[PDB]
Amino acid sequence: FACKTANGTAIPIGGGSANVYVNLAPVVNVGQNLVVDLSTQIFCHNDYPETITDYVTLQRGSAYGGVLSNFSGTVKYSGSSYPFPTTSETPRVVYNSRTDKPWPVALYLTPVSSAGGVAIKAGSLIAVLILRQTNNYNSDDFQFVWNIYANNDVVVPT
Ligand SMILES: CCCCCCCO[C@H]1CO[C@H](CO)[C@@H](O)[C@H](O)[C@@H]1O
């Protein structure tokens, strides 16, 4: 089991960490969602589906910088929604193919009422997402850590 990003940055068998740079809607009004769809940027696969089934959770998701201070968050994992920053490990998604499958994570971030002006700074860390991989074969329990950075400023109109 291993993962890679849309630009080819990979985390190999056994886990590790990688940076993911995301383009963000540049203007987001109070009452609207900023959507960060990581399923278009993080992809994973099973290296031995003949014999092994892999299990993958979002173990936790943390918010940083402007996202922590200026937004109210929800994470959708494989079709179900949870608080973000997270309060529990998600259900498992099965990975059972050698063909890449997106990691089905999307953040929905809506401005808090105090938000205004440059709410996320270009280049800043906005989230850390921990993908936890186990299987039905051995005792493997690996973390794939995704550090999410903003490619651009996000302005909340005042
Ligand atoms: C012939 C026996 C092979 C032994 C395979 C033991 C280690 O397996 C690697 C290869 O990927 C499998 C399937 O994706 C993962 O479940 C593991 O966590 C780990 O990434």
Swiss-Prot record:
It is found in: Fimbrium. Keywords: Fimbrium, Signal. One of its GO terms (cellular component) is pilus. Its main location: other. GO terms for biological process: cell adhesion; cell adhesion involved in single-species biofilm formation; cell-substrate adhesion; mechanosensory behavior. It comes from the Bacteria. GO terms for molecular function: D-mannose binding. Belongs to the fimbrial protein family. Involved in regulation of length and mediation of adhesion of type 1 fimbriae (but not necessary for the production of fimbriae). Adhesin responsible for the binding to D-mannose. It is laterally positioned at intervals in the structure of the type 1 fimbriae. In order to integrate FimH in the fimbriae FimF and FimG are needed. This is Type 1 fimbrin D-mannose specific adhesin. The chain holds residues 22 to 179 of 300 of the full protein.
